[PDB]
């Protein structure tokens, strides 16, 4: 619209703001004995996650402790380094903040902004399906962050309900940047959950940032319907259906939703909304989103569709005497 150029200009500072952090990434912005270990939120594959309280600010963070040796053994030195490099340079309202990042002789630490909400997958199974104006609320946030990400030449390539958490404010928080890559052109690496994989990826051909727009379709659909547009039992058949490109909308889907989904879920990489001349705008302008105030969403002004509800054991913290696999995580 009118002075709707201040977007092409917002996207330009965020860039000069990312590359700067990308060129010379921040390391060791804190240390273990600076936080008060509250509880153990759970143990993952590389290591456990502990709720912590920053002694000084008295703030609450989600420290993801990930064993240096164990990481290497699991064969993921690069995947780890890359996820920390992206998180550290990135900065956007619907992306988890990597508050602090440090290390020692035995393991790497990543202090995240703590969120109590929970995964979209969960909320989806509980609520069943979402109101069109509810999914629209979420899709809006996804659309914005992909615009942010893509401006930076970052392909998320892992959009799915599990990677989406809900704020104590009701908003989205994209998490887990494992498979994210900085790419100008096309790439080939296969990954991510099958029902969101776009035809390009499956047909082992070259793919680009358009993969995220396809997934957004699968996601918008699943939210409003209550189940993914392409679901099977065995992978081989999902692929089949994901390539056929034939979507069947549940009868209650609005005429507007159907249109938007049809453009997003288009096998033709040259007709897909998002990978076109008018780029992101074919999506932000589409009638389905006509009721959404993009700047309000960004500012967190809009009202949330809902807000999730808000004898002490123990654990050890093995911070070894001499540095194990130190040469490997020099960049961390």
Curated annotation (Swiss-Prot):
Residues 290-332 form the AGC-kinase C-terminal domain. The keyword Lipoprotein applies. Keywords: ATP-binding, cAMP, Cell membrane, Cell projection, Cilium, Cytoplasm, Cytoplasmic vesicle, Flagellum, Kinase, Lipoprotein, Membrane, Mitochondrion, Myristate, Nucleotide-binding, Nucleus, Phosphoprotein, Serine/threonine-protein kinase, Transferase. GO terms for cellular component: acrosomal vesicle; axoneme; cAMP-dependent protein kinase complex; centrosome; ciliary base; cytoplasm; cytosol; glutamatergic synapse. The keyword Nucleotide-binding applies. Disruption phenotype: Frequent early postnatal lethality. Survivals are runted accompanied with mature sperm exhibiting defective forward motility. Its EC number is 2.7.11.11. The active site is at 158 (proton acceptor). The modification Phosphotyrosine is found at residue 312. Its main location: cytoplasm. It is a lipid-anchor. GO terms for molecular function: ATP binding; cAMP-dependent protein kinase activity; magnesium ion binding; manganese ion binding; protein domain specific binding; protein kinase A regulatory subunit binding; protein kinase activity; protein kinase binding. Belongs to the protein kinase superfamily. AGC Ser/Thr protein kinase family. cAMP subfamily. A number of inactive tetrameric holoenzymes are produced by the combination of homo- or heterodimers of the different regulatory subunits associated with two catalytic subunits. Protein kinase A holoenzyme is comprised of two catalytic (C) and two regulatory (R) subunits which keep the enzyme in an inhibited state before activation by cyclic-AMP. cAMP causes the dissociation of the inactive holoenzyme into a dimer of regulatory subunits bound to four cAMP and two free monomeric catalytic subunits. The cAMP-dependent protein kinase catalytic subunit binds PJA2. This is cAMP-dependent protein kinase catalytic subunit alpha. The gene is Prkaca.
């Amino acid at each position: 619209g009118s002075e709707q150029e201040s977007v092409k200009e917002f996207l330009a500072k965020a860039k000069e703001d990312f590359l700067k952090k990308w060129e010379t990434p921040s390391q060791n912005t804190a240390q273990l004995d600076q936080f008060d270990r509250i509880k153990t939120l759970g143990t993952g594959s590389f290591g456990r996650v502990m709720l912590v309280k920053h002694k000084e600010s008295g703030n609450h963070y989600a420290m993801k402790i990930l064993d240096k040796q164990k990481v290497v053994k699991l064969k993921q030195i690069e995947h780890t380094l890359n996820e920390k490099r992206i998180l550290q340079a990135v900065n956007f309202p619907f992306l988890v903040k990597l508050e602090f990042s440090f290390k020692d002789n035995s393991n790497l630490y990543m202090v995240m902004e703590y969120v109590a909400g929970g995964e979209m997958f969960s909320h989806l199974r509980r609520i069943g399906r979402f109101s069109e104006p509810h999914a629209r609320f979420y899709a809006a946030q996804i659309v914005l962050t992909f615009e942010y990400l893509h401006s930076l030449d970052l392909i998320y390539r892992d959009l799915k309900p599990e990677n989406l958490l809900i704020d104590q404010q009701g908003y989205i928080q994209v998490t887990d940047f494992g498979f994210a890559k900085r790419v100008k052109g096309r790439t080939w690496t296969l990954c991510g959950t099958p029902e969101y994989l776009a035809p390009e990826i499956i047909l082992s051909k070259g793919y680009n940032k358009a993969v995220d727009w396809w997934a957004l379709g699968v996601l918008i659909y699943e939210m409003a319907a209550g189940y993914p547009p392409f679901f099977a039992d065995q992978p081989i058949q999902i692929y089949e259906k994901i390539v056929s490109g034939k979507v069947r909308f549940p009868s209650h889907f609005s005429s507007d939703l159907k249109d938007l989904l049809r453009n997003l879920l288009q096998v033709d990489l040259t007709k897909r909304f998002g990978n076109l001349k008018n780029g992101v705008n074919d999506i932000k302008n589409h009638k389905w989103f006509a009721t959404t105030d993009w700047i309000a969403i960004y500012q967190r002004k809009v009202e949330a569709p809902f807000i999730p509800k808000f004898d002490y054991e123990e654990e050890e913290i093995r911070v070894s005497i001499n540095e194990k696999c130190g040469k490997e995580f020099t960049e961390f």
